[model samples]
Target: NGNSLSAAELTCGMIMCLARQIPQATASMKDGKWERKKFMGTELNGKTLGILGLGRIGREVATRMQSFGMKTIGYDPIISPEVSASFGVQQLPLEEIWPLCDFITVHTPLLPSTTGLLNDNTFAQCKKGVRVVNCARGGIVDEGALLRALQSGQCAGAALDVFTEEPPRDRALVDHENVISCPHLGASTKEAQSR
Candidate 1:
C-alpha cells in the first residue's frame, strides 16, 4: 500500500524532471555553466503518457499522470480493463499505444520475454520525436535500436534508469545528446532499505 504511493511520487517527479530538463539544467549549473538555452523543454499538460505495464508502480504512475491532465494509456497482458479504468487509463495493445503517446514510460519486471522487447520494430511504431522514460528492468529496450532511433530522429529523447548491462562498459550511450542514463536505483528508497 505505502510502497506504491511512494513510488508514484518519486516516479512522477522523475518524469517531470526529465520532461522539463530539470536534471540537465541542474547538472550544467553545477558544472559552472549557464546552459539556459539548452534546457528548453516541453510541458506535460495534455500530453499522452504511455505506461508499458499496469502493475503496482505503473498504475500509480498512471494515476499521477492523470492528475497532471495527461491522457494515460497502458499496455499490459495481465491487467483487467476494469482495474485500469479506475485510474482513467485506456488499455491498448503495445503496438497501438506506441504511436499515440507523446511520452512512454516502462514499469515492467525483467523477464525472458521482455528482454529486447523494444527494438527497431517497436521504435518504428512511435510518433516521430516521442520521448521515453524507462525505470523498469534492463534489456527491455535494445540500446542499439534506441541509438538508431535517436540518430534517425524517430525518438526525441530518453531517460533510462537501467540498461542491458549494469555499470555499462560501453560509453556510446553516455556520449549521446538524446539519451539520459542513470544507474539502476528504482528500489533504493529509505523505506525499501528498511524493508
Candidate 2:
C-alpha cells in the first residue's frame, strides 16, 4: 500500500521536470547561465495524461495529476474503466492512447508485452511534441528509439529514471537538450523512505 506513493511521487516529479525544463534550467543556473525566457514552459491544466498501466502506482499518479487539472487516460490490458474512472482515466487501446496524450508516463511491470513498448514504431505513432516518462522499468522503452524521436522532435521532451542499461552506455540520450535523465531516484526521497 505505502509502496504505491513511493513510486507515484517520482512520476509526479518527472512530469514537472519535463514540462517546465526544470533539470535543464537548473543545470544552466548552476553554471552561471541565465535563461528565464528560453526555459518557457507549458501548463498541465488542460493536458491529456496517458498512463500505460493503470495499476497501483500508475493510478496514484493519475489521481495526483487530477489535482493539477490534467485529464487522465490509459491503456492497460488488466484494468477496467470502472475502476479507474474516479481518477478520470478513460480506457483506451495502445493505438488510441499514443496520438491522444500530451504527456505519457509508463508504470507497467517489466514483461514482453511491455518491454520496449515505446520503440521506433510506437514513437512514430505518438503526437508530435509529446512528453514521455518511463519510471516503470529499464527495459520498457527503447533508448535508441527515444534518442531518434528527440532528435526528430517527434517527442518534445522526456524524463527517464530507468534505462535499458542502468548506467546507460548511450550518453547521447542522457545528455540530450530535451531530456531529463536520473539514476533511478524513485524510492530515494525522504517521504518515501520514511513512509
Candidate 3:
C-alpha cells in the first residue's frame, strides 16, 4: 500500500514527460542543440485518464490527479462500476476505456488475462495519440504492438518503467522518439524501500 505513493508519483511524472516530450527535449539539448519550438506540453486538467486496473496504485494516481481536474475512467475485470468508493473512478470495460482515454496508466497484476494486454487489436482501438504510462508490470504490454503504434502515430508517446524482459535488449521501441523507457525502477525511492 505504501509503495503505491511512489508508483503513482512516477506515473504522473511519466505522463507529464510524455505529454510534453521532456525526455526528447532534454536529449535534443546535446551541448549544441536548442529546440525551443519542441516539447509543447499538454495540460492534464479536464482530460480523460484511463486506469487499466483500479487497485491501490491506480487509486493513488486518480486522487493525485484529481487536483488537476482530470477525469478518471477505470477498467478492472472484477471491480463493479458503481459503489466503488475509490476516489471518484468511473469503471468500464477494457473496450470502452480504449477509445475514450486521453492517457492510460496500467496497474493490473500480471495474469493470464493481463498478459500482453496492450496488443495489436487493443492498440488499434486506442484513441489516436493516447499517451501511455506503465509503472506496473511490463508483461501487460506487448512491446511490438507498442512499437507499431508509436511509429504510426496512433499512440503519441509512452513512459515505461517495466518491461517483458529486464535490461531489455531490443532497442527499437525504447529508442523510438515517442517513448520514455526505464529499467525497472518503480520502487527505488526511500519511502518504498524503507523497512
Candidate 4:
C-alpha cells in the first residue's frame, strides 16, 4: 500500500515536472542561467491523461490529477468500466487512449505483451508533443523509441523513474534535456521506507 501511494504521488510529480519543464528550469537555475523563452511550460488544466494499467497506482494518480481538472481516461486488463467510473475515470481501449492523451503515464507491470508498449508505432499514434511519465517499470516504453520521439519532437517531454537497466550504460535518454529522470526513486519516500 505504501509503495503504491508513494509511486502514485511520484507519478503525479513527474507529470507536473514534464508539463512545466521543472527539471530543465531547475538545471538552468543551478547552471546560472534564466531563459524564460526556453522554459515556457504548459498548463495541466483541461488536458487529458491516459493511464495504462488502471490498478492501485493508476487509480491513485488519476484521482489526484482529477483535482487539477485533468480528464482521466485509462485501460486495464481487469478493471471494469463501472469500477473506474466510480473514481471519475473513463475506461477506453488502448487504441483510443493513445491519441486522446495530452500526457500518458504507465502503471503496468513488465510483461511480454507490455514490453515496448510505447514503441515507435505507438508514439506516432500519439498526439504530437504528447508527454510521457514512466514510474511503472522499465522497458514498458522502449528507450530507443522514446529517444527518437524526443529528437523528432513527437514527444515533448518524459519523466522516467525506472530503466531497463538500472544505472543505464547508455545515457542518451538520461542525458536528453527534455527528459527528467530520478534514478528509480519512485518508491523512495520516507513513508514507504518506514512501511
Candidate 5:
C-alpha cells in the first residue's frame, strides 16, 4: 500500500532526470568539467507524459507529474477511464498513446502480454526524440530493442530501474550514454520501508 508512493516518486524523478540529463551533468561536474552547453536539458512543463498501467503507483505518478504542468495520458487493461480521469490521466489505447508521449513511464507488473511492451515495433511508433522511464519491472521494455532505438536515435533517452535480469549481465543498454539506470531502487526509501 504505502510502497506505491515511493515508486511513484522515483518514477517522477527518473522522468525529470531523463529530460534534464541530471545524472550526466553531475557526472561531468564531478569530473571537474564545466561544459554547460554540452548538457543542454529540456523542460518537463508543457510535455505529454504517458503512464502505462494506471494502477496505484501509476495513478500516483500521474498526479505528481501533473503538478509539473505535464499533460498525463495513460493506458491500463483493467482501469476504467473515469477512474483514471479522476486523477487527471486521460486513458488511451497503446496505439494512440505511443505517438503522443514526450516521456513514457511504465507501472504495470510483468505479465506475458506486457513483456517487451516497448519493443522495436512500439519504439518505431513513438515520435522521434521521445524519452522513456521504466521503474515498474524489467523486460517490460525490451532491453535489446531499447539499445537499438538509442543507437538509431529513434529514442532520445531512457531511465531504467529494473532489468530483465537483475544486475543485468549484458551492460550494453546500461552502459549507453543516453540511459540513466538505477539498481532497482524504486521503493528503497526508509519511509517506504517503515510503511
Candidate 6:
C-alpha cells in the first residue's frame, strides 16, 4: 500500500531489543558493569502483540511480527475488514484485546480520543506483566497511569520514544527500573531525514 518498506524494520528491531532488555544490558556494559541477572528479558516467539492502530506502519509491523512467529492482533477504528483480512490480523475492540496481549505497541496518533487512552481503566484491562512500546505520540498513553501500572506490577516495562512533553523534565520514569526512557528518535534515520 505504500512506496517504501516503511520503518517497520527499524521498529521491529527496537521492539525486539526492548522486549529482551538488550539496551539496558549494553548500557551497563559500556559503564564497565555486568549484571546479567538484573537484565532478564522475555521471548518474542509465540507472544501476542496488540497494535493500537492499523495503518501502513502498523500493518508493516504486523507483517514483521508474523515473520517472528508472533501472533498479531490490532485495534483501529478506521481499518476496514478487507485490510484486516489482507494482513491476517484479527481486529478487536481495544478492551477486548487489552488483556490478551503480551506486548502492546501503540501506533495511533495524538487525538482527543487517543490521548490518555491507556489510562487507569485500560491499564487494569491489560495482562499482568505486559510490556508497552510506544513509538507513536506520547500523549496517547498517560504517563501517570503508566507509572502507576509499572509500580503496581500491572505493566512490566515500557519503551517510550515520545512524551507528552518533549525533553521530559519529570524523572519519575528514569528512576524506575522497569521503564525504559528514550528521547524522541522515531524518524532520526538518514533516509527519513532526507525525505
lDDT, candidate 3, equals 0.85
How far residue 91's Cα lies from its native spot in candidate 4, in Å, is 0.8
lDDT of each: 0.81, 0.89, 0.85, 0.93, 0.93, 0.83
lDDT of 5 by residue, 1-195 (tens): 688898998998999898888899999999999988988988889999999999999999988999999999999989999999899999988999999999999988889999999999999999998899999999999998999999998899999999999999999998899999899999899998885
Ranking by lDDT: 4, 5, 2, 3, 6, 1
Backbone clashes for every candidate come to 0, 0, 0, 0, 0, 0
Clashing pairs in 5: none
Tens digit of per-residue lDDT, candidate 4, span 1-195: 769989999999999998888778888999999889998888999999999988889999999999999999999988999999999889988999889999999998899989999999999999999999999899999999999999999999899999999988899999999999998998898889995
Superpose all Cα atoms of candidate 4 onto the true structure and report the RMSD in Å to 1 decimal: 0.8
Model 1 ranges off by over 4 Å: 1-7
Worst 10 residues of 2 by lDDT: 186-195
Candidate 3: tens digits of C-alpha lDDT, residues 97-157: 8999999889999999888788889988988988888899977888898888888899998
On lDDT, the leading prediction is: 4
TM-score list, all predictions: 0.91, 0.95, 0.94, 0.98, 0.98, 0.92
Model 6 per-residue lDDT tens digits across residues 20-120: 78878887899999898888777799999998888888888898898888999988898885788799789988778998999888888799999998899
Q: Report residue 51 deviation for candidate 1 (angstroms).
A: 0.5
Compared with the true structure, model 5 gives a TM-score of: 0.98
Q: Worst 10-residue stretch by lDDT in candidate 5?
A: 1-10
Q: What TM-score quantifies how close candidate 6 is to the native fold?
A: 0.92
**Candidate 4 — which pairs collide?**
none
Q: Where in model 3 is the C-alpha error above 4 Å?
A: 83-85
